[PDB]
Design a protein around this ligand. Structure first.
Ligand SMILES: CC(C)C[C@H](NP(=O)(O)CNC(=O)OCc1ccccc1)C(=O)NC[C@@H](C)C(C)C
Ligand SMILES: [Ca+2]
Ligand SMILES: [Ca+2]
Ligand SMILES: [Ca+2]
Ligand SMILES: [Ca+2]
Ligand SMILES: [Zn+2]
Length: 316
C-alpha cells in the first residue's frame, strides 16, 4: 500500500519485545519499506485461502497474543533479507528485490510451514507438536531459503535433489540464526517444537541420528514417504555441512573445521553457480569442492575439509 514508513513495537511468539517496520495509511500495516521492494505480512485468519489480508493494526502496537506470529514472521523475514544482502550480496530471493510475502494463522492446528511457490505460509501449530512456527528464526530462514533455491539451483523436491533442497534450507536457516546471534545452535526448530519437552528439536545437524535421521549415505532412506525422504536424508548433507564448519571425527574420518562463514560461502556458491534441478549427493560434493576451489584454491585447507566431510558421510 502507499503510505509512510513507520516503526511499531510488539511482542513475538516467545514473549520478547521487538520493533517492526510498518506503513501508515489510515491503519498501520505490516509492510516494511526499508528492505528491497518490501516485506509484507498477511493474516490468513485460520483459513487456507492465500495470502489473506495485509495485516492491519489501529495503533502500531502489536502486543496481543493474536499478533505474536505476525510480529515474528515479519521481523525474522527482515533478518533473513539482511543476511542474504549483507553476507552474500543477494537482493531478496530472486536477486532483484522481489517483495517478500508471508501469511500467518494458516489453517487450524497446523503443524508446518512452507513456501507455496510465491510466498511463505506459517501454521500456528496445535500447541503440542508446535507453537506458531514463525517464532523460530531458523524456521523463517528455512522457508525463505526455499524461495532462493527455487530461483537458483531449482532442486526438484524429491529423492536426493529434494534432500539437498531441504539441507540447503536447514543450513541457511542455521546460518541466519547464528547471524542474529540469539541462542544459536545447530538444531532445527527448537524454539517452536514441543513446548512440553525441553531440550529437543525437530532435526539436529550436529547429530541427525538423535531424531532417527541418517548421518551416513549407507543409512539413507529409499522408500516413497516424504517425497522419498527429503526431510530424512537431509541429515546426511546437514551432517556434512556441520563437519565442514565445526570439524569432528565421524565413523573414524576426521574433518578439520573451517568455520560457519566459509561454510556459507562454499554452499552459497554451490547453490547459485553449480547445482541444477537434478543434482544428486555425489554432484553436490563435486559442486562444493569446485566452489571451495574457486574461493580458496585447489591446495587449500577449505577444499581438503570439504572432501573429508563428504568422505565422513559416505558420499563420493
Ligand atoms: C523447519 C520446519 C519447522 C518446517 C519445514 N517446513 P517445509 O520443509 O518448508 C514443508 C511441500 C510443498 C508445498 C507447496 C508447494 C510445493 C511443495 C519442515 O521441515 N517441515 C516438515 C516437518 C513438519 C516434518 C513433518 C518432517
Ligand atoms: Ca495494536
Ligand atoms: Ca537456537
Ligand atoms: Ca536452531
Ligand atoms: Ca521442545
Ligand atoms: Zn523445507
Amino acid at each position: 500500500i502507499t503510505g509512510t514508513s513507520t516503526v511499531g513495537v510488539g511482542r513475538g511468539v516467545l514473549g520478547d519485545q521487538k520493533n517492526i517496520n510498518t506503513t501508515y495509511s489510515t491503519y498501520y500495516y505490516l509492510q516494511d519499506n526499508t528492505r528491497g521492494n518490501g516485506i509484507f505480512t498477511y493474516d490468513a485468519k485460520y483459513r487456507t485461502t492465500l495470502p489473506g489480508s495485509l495485516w492491519a493494526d489501529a495503533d502500531n502496537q502489536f502486543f496481543a497474543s493474536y499478533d505474536a506470529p505476525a510480529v515474528d514472521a515479519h521481523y525474522y523475514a527482515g533478518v533473513t533479507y539482511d543476511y542474504y544482502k549483507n553476507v552474500h550480496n543477494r537482493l531478496s530471493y530472486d536477486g532483484n528485490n522481489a517483495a517478500i510475502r508471508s501469511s500467518v494463522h494458516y489453517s487450524q492446528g497446523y503443524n508446518n510451514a512452507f513456501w507455496n511457490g510465491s510466498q511463505m505460509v506459517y501454521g500456528d501449530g496445535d500447541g503440542q507438536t508446535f507453537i506458531p512456527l514463525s517464532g523460530g528464526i531458523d524456521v523463517v530462514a528455512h522457508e525463505l531459503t526455499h524461495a532462493v533455491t527455487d530461483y537458483t539451483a531449482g532442486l526438484i523436491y524429491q529423492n536426493e535433489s529434494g534432500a539437498i533442497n531441504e539441507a540447503i534450507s536447514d543450513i541457511f536457516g542455521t546460518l541466519v540464526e547464528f547471524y542474529a546471534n540469539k541462542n544459536p545452535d545447530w538444531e532445527i526448530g527448537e524454539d517452536v517444537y514441543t513446548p512440553g519437552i525441553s531440550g529437543d528439536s525437530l532435526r539436529s545437524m550436529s547429530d541427525p541420528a538423535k531424531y532417527g535421521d541418517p548421518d551416513h549415505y549407507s543409512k539413507r532412506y529409499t522408500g516413497t514417504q516424504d517425497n522419498g525422504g527429503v526431510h530424512i536424508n537431509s541429515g546426511i548433507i546437514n551432517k556434512a555441512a556441520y563437519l565442514i564448519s565445526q570439524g569432528g571425527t565421524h565413523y573414524g574420518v576426521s574433518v578439520v573445521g573451517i568455520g560457519r562463514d566459509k561454510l556459507g560461502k562454499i554452499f552459497y556458491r554451490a547453490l547459485t553457480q553449480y547445482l541444477t534441478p537434478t543434482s544428486n549427493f555425489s554432484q553436490l560434493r563435486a559442486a562444493a569442492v569446485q566452489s571451495a576451489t574457486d574461493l580458496y584454491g585447489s591446495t587449500s585447507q577449505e577444499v581438503a575439509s570439504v572432501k573429508q566431510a563428504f568422505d565422513a558421510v559416505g558420499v563420493k
